[PDB]
Symmetry: D2
Subunit: 121 residues, 4 copies
Protein backbone atom coordinates (compact mmCIF):
# COMPACT_ATOMS: atom_id res chain seq x y z
CA UNK A 1 0.00 0.00 0.00
CA UNK A 2 1.09 3.58 -0.57
CA UNK A 3 0.35 6.82 1.24
CA UNK A 4 1.60 10.22 0.18
CA UNK A 5 0.84 13.74 -0.95
CA UNK A 6 0.16 15.04 -4.42
CA UNK A 7 1.09 18.71 -4.87
CA UNK A 8 -1.24 20.79 -7.03
CA UNK A 9 1.75 22.51 -8.62
CA UNK A 10 3.53 19.29 -9.59
CA UNK A 11 2.95 19.18 -13.35
CA UNK A 12 4.84 15.89 -13.79
CA UNK A 13 2.70 14.20 -11.16
CA UNK A 14 3.56 12.06 -8.15
CA UNK A 15 4.82 8.56 -8.94
CA UNK A 16 3.58 6.04 -6.36
CA UNK A 17 5.07 2.70 -5.31
CA UNK A 18 2.03 0.91 -6.70
CA UNK A 19 2.45 -1.15 -9.83
CA UNK A 20 -0.97 -2.00 -11.25
CA UNK A 21 -0.92 -5.53 -12.67
CA UNK A 22 -3.62 -7.24 -14.74
CA UNK A 23 -6.37 -8.52 -12.46
CA UNK A 24 -5.47 -6.18 -9.61
CA UNK A 25 -8.26 -4.68 -7.53
CA UNK A 26 -7.39 -1.38 -5.92
CA UNK A 27 -8.90 1.17 -3.59
CA UNK A 28 -7.91 4.81 -3.45
CA UNK A 29 -9.01 7.46 -0.94
CA UNK A 30 -8.04 11.09 -1.53
CA UNK A 31 -8.60 14.06 0.77
CA UNK A 32 -7.60 17.69 1.16
CA UNK A 33 -7.73 21.15 -0.33
CA UNK A 34 -5.98 22.61 -3.37
CA UNK A 35 -6.17 25.38 -5.96
CA UNK A 36 -5.36 25.87 -9.63
CA UNK A 37 -4.84 29.60 -9.04
CA UNK A 38 -7.64 31.38 -7.16
CA UNK A 39 -7.43 32.19 -3.47
CA UNK A 40 -10.22 29.63 -2.81
CA UNK A 41 -9.61 25.93 -2.57
CA UNK A 42 -11.43 22.84 -3.84
CA UNK A 43 -11.50 19.17 -2.90
CA UNK A 44 -10.33 16.16 -4.98
CA UNK A 45 -13.34 16.46 -7.31
CA UNK A 46 -12.15 19.94 -8.35
CA UNK A 47 -14.19 22.98 -9.38
CA UNK A 48 -17.50 21.99 -10.97
CA UNK A 49 -18.07 25.59 -12.20
CA UNK A 50 -14.82 26.02 -14.11
CA UNK A 51 -14.59 25.57 -17.90
CA UNK A 52 -12.19 23.08 -19.47
CA UNK A 53 -9.56 25.18 -21.26
CA UNK A 54 -7.28 22.28 -22.19
CA UNK A 55 -7.08 20.12 -19.06
CA UNK A 56 -4.86 17.04 -18.97
CA UNK A 57 -8.05 15.09 -18.20
CA UNK A 58 -11.25 16.09 -19.98
CA UNK A 59 -13.31 13.61 -17.92
CA UNK A 60 -12.76 15.43 -14.61
CA UNK A 61 -13.09 19.03 -13.42
CA UNK A 62 -10.19 21.46 -13.21
CA UNK A 63 -8.56 20.91 -9.83
CA UNK A 64 -9.59 17.24 -9.57
CA UNK A 65 -7.24 14.36 -8.80
CA UNK A 66 -6.49 12.10 -11.76
CA UNK A 67 -3.99 9.37 -12.50
CA UNK A 68 -2.04 7.56 -15.17
CA UNK A 69 -1.27 3.85 -15.05
CA UNK A 70 1.93 3.08 -16.94
CA UNK A 71 1.56 4.92 -20.24
CA UNK A 72 -2.23 5.14 -20.18
CA UNK A 73 -4.11 8.36 -20.75
CA UNK A 74 -5.43 10.22 -17.70
CA UNK A 75 -8.08 8.48 -15.60
CA UNK A 76 -10.28 10.34 -13.09
CA UNK A 77 -9.70 9.52 -9.42
CA UNK A 78 -11.60 12.33 -7.73
CA UNK A 79 -12.32 11.39 -4.09
CA UNK A 80 -11.18 7.85 -4.81
CA UNK A 81 -11.97 4.43 -6.22
CA UNK A 82 -13.53 1.52 -4.35
CA UNK A 83 -12.34 -1.99 -5.23
CA UNK A 84 -11.67 -0.82 -8.77
CA UNK A 85 -10.37 -2.79 -11.76
CA UNK A 86 -8.56 -1.02 -14.62
CA UNK A 87 -9.55 -1.25 -18.29
CA UNK A 88 -8.12 -4.04 -20.42
CA UNK A 89 -4.40 -3.79 -21.19
CA UNK A 90 -3.84 -0.97 -18.74
CA UNK A 91 -0.93 -1.71 -16.43
CA UNK A 92 2.17 -0.25 -14.80
CA UNK A 93 3.18 2.30 -12.17
CA UNK A 94 0.46 4.59 -10.84
CA UNK A 95 1.21 8.29 -11.13
CA UNK A 96 -1.14 10.75 -9.41
CA UNK A 97 -1.67 14.18 -10.98
CA UNK A 98 -3.57 17.38 -10.24
CA UNK A 99 -5.88 18.22 -13.17
CA UNK A 100 -4.89 21.58 -14.71
CA UNK A 101 -3.94 23.02 -18.12
CA UNK A 102 -0.37 22.20 -19.20
CA UNK A 103 1.95 25.15 -18.63
CA UNK A 104 -0.26 26.71 -15.95
CA UNK A 105 0.76 24.67 -12.87
CA UNK A 106 3.14 27.32 -11.50
CA UNK A 107 0.46 29.26 -9.65
CA UNK A 108 -1.15 26.18 -8.07
CA UNK A 109 -1.22 25.60 -4.33
CA UNK A 110 -2.08 23.00 -1.72
CA UNK A 111 -2.13 19.23 -2.07
CA UNK A 112 -4.18 16.07 -1.65
CA UNK A 113 -3.38 13.33 0.84
CA UNK A 114 -3.86 9.99 -0.88
CA UNK A 115 -3.90 6.31 0.15
CA UNK A 116 -3.73 3.47 -2.33
CA UNK A 117 -4.03 -0.22 -1.54
CA UNK A 118 -4.50 -3.49 -3.37
CA UNK A 119 -7.61 -5.41 -2.37
CA UNK A 120 -8.05 -9.14 -2.04
CA UNK A 121 -8.84 -10.76 -5.39
CA UNK B 1 -19.99 -4.39 1.90
CA UNK B 2 -22.54 -1.64 1.41
CA UNK B 3 -23.20 0.82 -1.37
CA UNK B 4 -25.85 3.50 -1.33
CA UNK B 5 -26.77 7.15 -1.37
CA UNK B 6 -26.98 9.61 1.48
CA UNK B 7 -29.46 12.44 0.87
CA UNK B 8 -28.40 15.89 2.03
CA UNK B 9 -31.94 16.53 3.31
CA UNK B 10 -32.18 13.34 5.36
CA UNK B 11 -31.88 14.69 8.90
CA UNK B 12 -32.16 11.24 10.50
CA UNK B 13 -29.34 9.88 8.38
CA UNK B 14 -28.97 6.78 6.24
CA UNK B 15 -28.65 3.53 8.20
CA UNK B 16 -26.28 1.16 6.41
CA UNK B 17 -26.09 -2.65 6.57
CA UNK B 18 -22.64 -2.39 8.16
CA UNK B 19 -22.32 -3.32 11.80
CA UNK B 20 -18.96 -2.14 13.11
CA UNK B 21 -17.56 -4.73 15.54
CA UNK B 22 -14.51 -4.41 17.80
CA UNK B 23 -11.33 -5.00 15.82
CA UNK B 24 -13.00 -4.28 12.47
CA UNK B 25 -11.02 -2.42 9.82
CA UNK B 26 -13.16 -0.53 7.34
CA UNK B 27 -12.75 1.54 4.23
CA UNK B 28 -15.20 4.18 3.05
CA UNK B 29 -15.21 6.11 -0.24
CA UNK B 30 -17.70 8.98 -0.72
CA UNK B 31 -18.36 10.99 -3.86
CA UNK B 32 -20.82 13.47 -5.28
CA UNK B 33 -22.31 16.92 -4.94
CA UNK B 34 -24.74 18.36 -2.40
CA UNK B 35 -25.94 21.58 -0.78
CA UNK B 36 -27.10 22.78 2.61
CA UNK B 37 -29.19 25.51 0.96
CA UNK B 38 -27.35 27.66 -1.61
CA UNK B 39 -27.62 27.12 -5.34
CA UNK B 40 -23.97 25.95 -5.42
CA UNK B 41 -22.89 22.48 -4.45
CA UNK B 42 -19.98 21.07 -2.43
CA UNK B 43 -18.26 17.70 -2.20
CA UNK B 44 -18.09 15.30 0.79
CA UNK B 45 -15.69 17.62 2.64
CA UNK B 46 -18.35 20.35 2.67
CA UNK B 47 -17.90 24.14 2.52
CA UNK B 48 -14.62 25.27 4.08
CA UNK B 49 -15.77 28.92 4.06
CA UNK B 50 -19.01 28.48 6.01
CA UNK B 51 -19.25 29.20 9.76
CA UNK B 52 -20.41 26.54 12.20
CA UNK B 53 -23.82 27.68 13.42
CA UNK B 54 -24.63 24.55 15.43
CA UNK B 55 -23.62 21.65 13.18
CA UNK B 56 -24.28 18.05 14.23
CA UNK B 57 -20.53 17.57 13.85
CA UNK B 58 -18.20 20.36 14.94
CA UNK B 59 -15.12 18.52 13.59
CA UNK B 60 -16.23 18.78 9.94
CA UNK B 61 -17.44 21.58 7.66
CA UNK B 62 -21.09 22.31 6.97
CA UNK B 63 -22.09 20.07 4.06
CA UNK B 64 -19.54 17.34 4.87
CA UNK B 65 -20.32 13.64 5.22
CA UNK B 66 -20.20 12.33 8.79
CA UNK B 67 -21.30 9.15 10.55
CA UNK B 68 -22.40 7.62 13.79
CA UNK B 69 -21.48 4.12 14.88
CA UNK B 70 -24.11 2.68 17.19
CA UNK B 71 -24.83 5.44 19.70
CA UNK B 72 -21.50 7.24 19.26
CA UNK B 73 -21.27 10.97 18.65
CA UNK B 74 -20.70 12.15 15.10
CA UNK B 75 -17.43 11.16 13.42
CA UNK B 76 -16.11 12.92 10.28
CA UNK B 77 -16.04 10.80 7.11
CA UNK B 78 -15.45 13.49 4.47
CA UNK B 79 -14.16 11.85 1.27
CA UNK B 80 -13.67 8.58 3.13
CA UNK B 81 -11.59 6.49 5.47
CA UNK B 82 -8.80 4.11 4.50
CA UNK B 83 -8.41 0.89 6.49
CA UNK B 84 -9.72 2.71 9.54
CA UNK B 85 -10.22 1.40 13.08
CA UNK B 86 -12.80 2.99 15.41
CA UNK B 87 -12.03 4.40 18.84
CA UNK B 88 -12.23 2.11 21.86
CA UNK B 89 -15.73 0.93 22.81
CA UNK B 90 -17.28 2.30 19.65
CA UNK B 91 -19.44 -0.29 17.93
CA UNK B 92 -22.76 -0.90 16.19
CA UNK B 93 -24.59 -0.01 12.98
CA UNK B 94 -23.07 2.70 10.80
CA UNK B 95 -25.39 5.60 10.05
CA UNK B 96 -24.27 8.13 7.43
CA UNK B 97 -25.38 11.74 7.79
CA UNK B 98 -25.04 15.04 5.97
CA UNK B 99 -23.51 17.67 8.29
CA UNK B 100 -25.97 20.53 8.79
CA UNK B 101 -27.68 22.43 11.63
CA UNK B 102 -30.60 20.55 13.22
CA UNK B 103 -33.94 21.85 11.98
CA UNK B 104 -32.46 23.26 8.76
CA UNK B 105 -32.28 20.13 6.56
CA UNK B 106 -35.48 20.89 4.65
CA UNK B 107 -33.82 23.13 2.06
CA UNK B 108 -30.94 20.71 1.40
CA UNK B 109 -30.35 19.09 -1.97
CA UNK B 110 -28.29 16.45 -3.72
CA UNK B 111 -26.64 13.41 -2.21
CA UNK B 112 -23.38 11.51 -1.81
CA UNK B 113 -22.70 8.08 -3.28
CA UNK B 114 -20.94 6.02 -0.64
CA UNK B 115 -19.21 2.62 -0.51
CA UNK B 116 -18.28 0.88 2.73
CA UNK B 117 -16.40 -2.37 3.11
CA UNK B 118 -14.64 -4.33 5.83
CA UNK B 119 -10.95 -4.94 5.19
CA UNK B 120 -8.89 -7.99 6.00
CA UNK B 121 -7.68 -8.00 9.62
CA UNK C 1 -5.71 -12.34 12.69
CA UNK C 2 -4.58 -15.16 14.96
CA UNK C 3 -1.75 -17.64 14.78
CA UNK C 4 -1.12 -20.40 17.29
CA UNK C 5 -0.84 -24.06 18.08
CA UNK C 6 -3.56 -26.53 18.93
CA UNK C 7 -2.34 -29.44 21.07
CA UNK C 8 -3.77 -32.88 20.27
CA UNK C 9 -4.03 -33.61 23.98
CA UNK C 10 -5.95 -30.44 24.88
CA UNK C 11 -9.47 -31.77 25.42
CA UNK C 12 -10.90 -28.33 26.22
CA UNK C 13 -9.59 -26.88 22.99
CA UNK C 14 -7.57 -23.79 22.16
CA UNK C 15 -9.52 -20.52 22.44
CA UNK C 16 -8.41 -18.07 19.75
CA UNK C 17 -8.58 -14.26 19.70
CA UNK C 18 -11.05 -14.41 16.82
CA UNK C 19 -14.64 -13.47 17.49
CA UNK C 20 -16.79 -14.55 14.56
CA UNK C 21 -19.50 -11.96 13.92
CA UNK C 22 -22.49 -12.22 11.57
CA UNK C 23 -21.38 -11.53 8.01
CA UNK C 24 -17.73 -12.27 8.72
CA UNK C 25 -15.68 -14.06 6.05
CA UNK C 26 -12.76 -16.02 7.41
CA UNK C 27 -9.86 -18.09 6.14
CA UNK C 28 -8.10 -20.78 8.13
CA UNK C 29 -4.94 -22.71 7.22
CA UNK C 30 -3.85 -25.63 9.42
CA UNK C 31 -0.65 -27.65 9.17
CA UNK C 32 1.35 -30.22 11.09
CA UNK C 33 1.38 -33.71 12.55
CA UNK C 34 -0.47 -35.22 15.50
CA UNK C 35 -1.72 -38.48 17.00
CA UNK C 36 -4.69 -39.73 18.98
CA UNK C 37 -2.58 -42.53 20.48
CA UNK C 38 -0.60 -44.59 17.94
CA UNK C 39 3.10 -44.03 17.27
CA UNK C 40 2.23 -42.77 13.76
CA UNK C 41 1.01 -39.28 13.05
CA UNK C 42 -1.69 -37.79 10.82
CA UNK C 43 -2.33 -34.37 9.30
CA UNK C 44 -5.25 -31.99 10.04
CA UNK C 45 -7.68 -34.22 8.11
CA UNK C 46 -7.02 -37.02 10.61
CA UNK C 47 -7.03 -40.80 10.05
CA UNK C 48 -9.38 -41.84 7.25
CA UNK C 49 -9.11 -45.51 8.25
CA UNK C 50 -10.14 -45.17 11.89
CA UNK C 51 -13.70 -45.89 13.07
CA UNK C 52 -15.73 -43.25 14.90
CA UNK C 53 -16.08 -44.54 18.47
CA UNK C 54 -17.73 -41.42 19.91
CA UNK C 55 -15.80 -38.48 18.43
CA UNK C 56 -16.62 -34.90 19.43
CA UNK C 57 -17.21 -34.31 15.72
CA UNK C 58 -18.91 -37.03 13.69
CA UNK C 59 -18.40 -35.09 10.44
CA UNK C 60 -14.59 -35.39 10.51
CA UNK C 61 -12.11 -38.23 11.00
CA UNK C 62 -10.47 -39.06 14.31
CA UNK C 63 -7.40 -36.84 14.58
CA UNK C 64 -8.82 -34.04 12.41
CA UNK C 65 -8.93 -30.37 13.38
CA UNK C 66 -12.39 -29.06 14.23
CA UNK C 67 -13.79 -25.93 15.84
CA UNK C 68 -16.62 -24.44 17.81
CA UNK C 69 -17.89 -20.90 17.30
CA UNK C 70 -19.42 -19.52 20.47
CA UNK C 71 -21.67 -22.30 21.74
CA UNK C 72 -22.12 -24.02 18.38
CA UNK C 73 -21.63 -27.74 17.89
CA UNK C 74 -18.36 -28.90 16.37
CA UNK C 75 -17.58 -27.84 12.81
CA UNK C 76 -14.90 -29.53 10.66
CA UNK C 77 -11.85 -27.42 9.82
CA UNK C 78 -9.49 -30.08 8.49
CA UNK C 79 -6.70 -28.42 6.44
CA UNK C 80 -8.63 -25.15 6.60
CA UNK C 81 -11.39 -22.98 5.21
CA UNK C 82 -11.16 -20.53 2.33
CA UNK C 83 -13.18 -17.30 2.56
CA UNK C 84 -15.79 -19.16 4.58
CA UNK C 85 -19.07 -17.88 6.03
CA UNK C 86 -20.64 -19.53 9.08
CA UNK C 87 -24.18 -20.92 9.20
CA UNK C 88 -27.01 -18.63 10.23
CA UNK C 89 -27.02 -17.57 13.89
CA UNK C 90 -23.58 -18.97 14.54
CA UNK C 91 -21.33 -16.44 16.24
CA UNK C 92 -18.78 -15.94 19.00
CA UNK C 93 -15.22 -16.85 19.93
CA UNK C 94 -13.53 -19.50 17.80
CA UNK C 95 -12.17 -22.46 19.74
CA UNK C 96 -9.99 -24.97 17.89
CA UNK C 97 -10.08 -28.61 18.98
CA UNK C 98 -8.43 -31.91 18.07
CA UNK C 99 -11.07 -34.52 17.15
CA UNK C 100 -10.95 -37.45 19.57
CA UNK C 101 -13.27 -39.37 21.90
CA UNK C 102 -14.01 -37.55 25.18
CA UNK C 103 -11.96 -38.95 28.05
CA UNK C 104 -9.25 -40.34 25.73
CA UNK C 105 -7.14 -37.20 25.09
CA UNK C 106 -4.45 -38.06 27.66
CA UNK C 107 -2.42 -40.25 25.29
CA UNK C 108 -2.51 -37.77 22.39
CA UNK C 109 0.60 -36.11 21.00
CA UNK C 110 1.77 -33.42 18.62
CA UNK C 111 -0.11 -30.32 17.51
CA UNK C 112 -1.31 -28.34 14.51
CA UNK C 113 -0.07 -24.87 13.62
CA UNK C 114 -3.06 -22.75 12.64
CA UNK C 115 -3.61 -19.30 11.11
CA UNK C 116 -6.99 -17.58 11.13
CA UNK C 117 -7.82 -14.27 9.48
CA UNK C 118 -10.87 -12.25 8.57
CA UNK C 119 -11.22 -11.57 4.85
CA UNK C 120 -12.52 -8.45 3.17
CA UNK C 121 -16.32 -8.42 2.94
CA UNK D 1 -9.13 -16.19 -7.25
CA UNK D 2 -8.86 -19.74 -8.53
CA UNK D 3 -10.43 -23.02 -7.47
CA UNK D 4 -9.73 -26.38 -9.03
CA UNK D 5 -8.43 -29.92 -8.70
CA UNK D 6 -4.89 -31.19 -8.95
CA UNK D 7 -4.69 -34.81 -10.08
CA UNK D 8 -2.04 -36.98 -8.41
CA UNK D 9 -1.25 -38.60 -11.76
CA UNK D 10 -0.76 -35.32 -13.64
CA UNK D 11 3.02 -35.20 -14.04
CA UNK D 12 2.98 -31.86 -15.88
CA UNK D 13 0.97 -30.21 -13.12
CA UNK D 14 -2.16 -28.08 -13.10
CA UNK D 15 -1.70 -24.55 -14.44
CA UNK D 16 -3.89 -22.10 -12.52
CA UNK D 17 -5.29 -18.71 -13.58
CA UNK D 18 -3.15 -17.03 -10.94
CA UNK D 19 -0.22 -14.93 -12.09
CA UNK D 20 1.99 -14.14 -9.12
CA UNK D 21 3.34 -10.58 -9.43
CA UNK D 22 6.03 -8.91 -7.31
CA UNK D 23 4.53 -7.73 -4.01
CA UNK D 24 1.55 -10.08 -4.25
CA UNK D 25 0.27 -11.68 -1.06
CA UNK D 26 -1.52 -14.97 -1.59
CA UNK D 27 -3.38 -17.58 0.39
CA UNK D 28 -3.77 -21.20 -0.61
CA UNK D 29 -5.91 -23.90 1.02
CA UNK D 30 -5.60 -27.50 -0.17
CA UNK D 31 -7.69 -30.49 0.88
CA UNK D 32 -8.33 -34.09 -0.08
CA UNK D 33 -6.84 -37.55 -0.47
CA UNK D 34 -4.36 -38.97 -2.97
CA UNK D 35 -1.80 -41.71 -3.52
CA UNK D 36 1.54 -42.14 -5.25
CA UNK D 37 0.83 -45.85 -5.73
CA UNK D 38 -0.26 -47.73 -2.59
CA UNK D 39 -3.87 -48.56 -1.86
CA UNK D 40 -3.81 -46.09 1.08
CA UNK D 41 -4.20 -42.36 0.62
CA UNK D 42 -2.51 -39.32 2.18
CA UNK D 43 -3.40 -35.66 2.60
CA UNK D 44 -1.69 -32.60 1.04
CA UNK D 45 1.34 -32.99 3.33
CA UNK D 46 2.03 -36.41 1.79
CA UNK D 47 3.54 -39.51 3.44
CA UNK D 48 5.95 -38.64 6.25
CA UNK D 49 7.27 -42.22 6.40
CA UNK D 50 8.29 -42.56 2.75
CA UNK D 51 11.89 -42.06 1.59
CA UNK D 52 12.78 -39.49 -1.08
CA UNK D 53 13.78 -41.51 -4.14
CA UNK D 54 14.15 -38.55 -6.49
CA UNK D 55 11.11 -36.36 -5.82
CA UNK D 56 10.45 -33.22 -7.86
CA UNK D 57 10.52 -31.36 -4.53
CA UNK D 58 13.04 -32.44 -1.91
CA UNK D 59 11.57 -30.05 0.69
CA UNK D 60 8.23 -31.88 0.93
CA UNK D 61 7.17 -35.49 1.44
CA UNK D 62 6.24 -37.85 -1.36
CA UNK D 63 2.55 -37.24 -2.07
CA UNK D 64 2.58 -33.61 -0.90
CA UNK D 65 1.22 -30.68 -2.90
CA UNK D 66 3.90 -28.38 -4.30
CA UNK D 67 3.97 -25.57 -6.85
CA UNK D 68 6.06 -23.69 -9.36
CA UNK D 69 5.74 -19.98 -9.96
CA UNK D 70 6.77 -19.10 -13.51
CA UNK D 71 10.05 -20.93 -14.04
CA UNK D 72 10.94 -21.24 -10.35
CA UNK D 73 11.97 -24.53 -8.80
CA UNK D 74 9.38 -26.44 -6.79
CA UNK D 75 8.01 -24.78 -3.64
CA UNK D 76 6.14 -26.73 -0.93
CA UNK D 77 2.45 -25.90 -0.54
CA UNK D 78 1.30 -28.79 1.65
CA UNK D 79 -2.04 -27.89 3.31
CA UNK D 80 -1.65 -24.30 2.12
CA UNK D 81 -0.06 -20.91 2.61
CA UNK D 82 -1.44 -18.05 4.66
CA UNK D 83 -0.91 -14.50 3.38
CA UNK D 84 2.34 -15.63 1.81
CA UNK D 85 4.90 -13.59 -0.16
CA UNK D 86 7.20 -15.27 -2.70
CA UNK D 87 10.98 -15.06 -2.64
CA UNK D 88 12.69 -12.22 -4.48
CA UNK D 89 12.50 -12.36 -8.28
CA UNK D 90 9.97 -15.19 -8.27
CA UNK D 91 7.00 -14.39 -10.49
CA UNK D 92 4.63 -15.78 -13.11
CA UNK D 93 1.82 -18.30 -13.48
CA UNK D 94 1.26 -20.68 -10.57
CA UNK D 95 1.34 -24.36 -11.47
CA UNK D 96 0.26 -26.89 -8.84
CA UNK D 97 1.88 -30.32 -8.82
CA UNK D 98 1.68 -33.59 -6.89
CA UNK D 99 5.09 -34.47 -5.44
CA UNK D 100 6.31 -37.77 -6.87
CA UNK D 101 9.36 -39.19 -8.69
CA UNK D 102 9.53 -38.29 -12.41
CA UNK D 103 8.39 -41.18 -14.59
CA UNK D 104 6.34 -42.81 -11.81
CA UNK D 105 3.11 -40.76 -11.95
CA UNK D 106 1.21 -43.37 -13.97
CA UNK D 107 0.08 -45.38 -10.96
CA UNK D 108 -1.04 -42.34 -8.93
CA UNK D 109 -4.63 -41.77 -7.87
CA UNK D 110 -6.95 -39.22 -6.29
CA UNK D 111 -6.58 -35.46 -6.28
CA UNK D 112 -6.47 -32.36 -4.08
CA UNK D 113 -9.07 -29.61 -4.14
CA UNK D 114 -7.28 -26.28 -4.03
CA UNK D 115 -8.28 -22.62 -3.61
CA UNK D 116 -5.91 -19.74 -4.33
CA UNK D 117 -6.61 -16.08 -3.76
CA UNK D 118 -4.73 -12.80 -3.68
CA UNK D 119 -4.89 -10.97 -0.35
CA UNK D 120 -5.10 -7.27 0.27
CA UNK D 121 -1.67 -5.61 0.22
C1 LIG E 1 -12.76 32.81 -14.32
O1 LIG E 1 -13.64 32.76 -13.46
C2 LIG E 1 -11.43 32.19 -14.04
C3 LIG E 1 -10.56 31.81 -15.08
C4 LIG E 1 -9.32 31.21 -14.77
C5 LIG E 1 -8.95 31.00 -13.43
O2 LIG E 1 -7.74 30.43 -13.17
C6 LIG E 1 -6.89 29.90 -14.14
O3 LIG E 1 -7.38 28.67 -14.60
C7 LIG E 1 -6.55 28.04 -15.58
C8 LIG E 1 -7.26 26.72 -15.96
O4 LIG E 1 -8.49 26.98 -16.61
C9 LIG E 1 -5.09 27.87 -15.05
O5 LIG E 1 -5.01 26.84 -14.06
C10 LIG E 1 -4.54 29.18 -14.49
O6 LIG E 1 -3.27 29.00 -13.86
C11 LIG E 1 -5.51 29.75 -13.45
O7 LIG E 1 -5.04 31.03 -13.03
C12 LIG E 1 -9.83 31.38 -12.39
C13 LIG E 1 -11.06 31.97 -12.70
C1 LIG F 1 -24.09 33.69 4.76
O1 LIG F 1 -24.09 34.53 3.85
C2 LIG F 1 -24.88 32.41 4.62
C3 LIG F 1 -25.70 31.96 5.67
C4 LIG F 1 -26.45 30.78 5.55
C5 LIG F 1 -26.40 30.01 4.37
O2 LIG F 1 -27.17 28.86 4.33
C6 LIG F 1 -27.80 28.31 5.46
O3 LIG F 1 -26.88 27.62 6.27
C7 LIG F 1 -27.44 27.03 7.46
C8 LIG F 1 -26.29 26.32 8.20
O4 LIG F 1 -25.27 27.24 8.55
C9 LIG F 1 -28.56 26.03 7.09
O5 LIG F 1 -28.02 24.89 6.41
C10 LIG F 1 -29.61 26.76 6.22
O6 LIG F 1 -30.67 25.91 5.81
C11 LIG F 1 -28.97 27.40 4.99
O7 LIG F 1 -29.99 28.18 4.36
C12 LIG F 1 -25.57 30.45 3.31
C13 LIG F 1 -24.82 31.65 3.43
C1 LIG G 1 -7.56 -50.35 16.19
O1 LIG G 1 -7.02 -50.42 15.08
C2 LIG G 1 -7.29 -49.16 17.05
C3 LIG G 1 -8.22 -48.72 18.02
C4 LIG G 1 -7.92 -47.58 18.80
C5 LIG G 1 -6.70 -46.89 18.61
O2 LIG G 1 -6.47 -45.79 19.39
C6 LIG G 1 -7.42 -45.29 20.28
O3 LIG G 1 -8.42 -44.59 19.61
C7 LIG G 1 -9.40 -43.95 20.45
C8 LIG G 1 -10.38 -43.20 19.52
O4 LIG G 1 -11.14 -44.14 18.78
C9 LIG G 1 -8.72 -43.02 21.49
O5 LIG G 1 -8.14 -41.86 20.87
C10 LIG G 1 -7.64 -43.78 22.25
O6 LIG G 1 -6.93 -42.88 23.09
C11 LIG G 1 -6.63 -44.38 21.26
O7 LIG G 1 -5.67 -45.15 21.97
C12 LIG G 1 -5.78 -47.34 17.64
C13 LIG G 1 -6.08 -48.46 16.86
C1 LIG H 1 8.32 -49.78 0.20
O1 LIG H 1 7.67 -50.49 0.97
C2 LIG H 1 7.62 -49.00 -0.88
C3 LIG H 1 8.31 -48.57 -2.04
C4 LIG H 1 7.65 -47.85 -3.05
C5 LIG H 1 6.28 -47.54 -2.93
O2 LIG H 1 5.69 -46.85 -3.96
C6 LIG H 1 6.39 -46.25 -5.01
O3 LIG H 1 6.91 -45.00 -4.65
C7 LIG H 1 7.62 -44.31 -5.68
C8 LIG H 1 8.16 -42.98 -5.12
O4 LIG H 1 9.10 -43.24 -4.08
C9 LIG H 1 6.68 -44.06 -6.89
O5 LIG H 1 5.66 -43.11 -6.55
C10 LIG H 1 6.09 -45.40 -7.34
O6 LIG H 1 5.14 -45.21 -8.38
C11 LIG H 1 5.39 -46.13 -6.19
O7 LIG H 1 5.02 -47.41 -6.69
C12 LIG H 1 5.58 -47.98 -1.77
C13 LIG H 1 6.25 -48.70 -0.76
CA1 LIG I 1 -3.04 26.96 -12.57
CA1 LIG J 1 -29.91 23.60 5.21
CA1 LIG K 1 -6.53 -40.60 22.33
CA1 LIG L 1 3.79 -43.12 -8.29
Amino acid sequence: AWKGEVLANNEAGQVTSIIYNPGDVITIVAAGWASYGPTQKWGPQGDREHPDQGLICHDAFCGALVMKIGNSGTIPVNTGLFRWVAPNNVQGAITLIYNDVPGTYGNNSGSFSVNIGKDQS
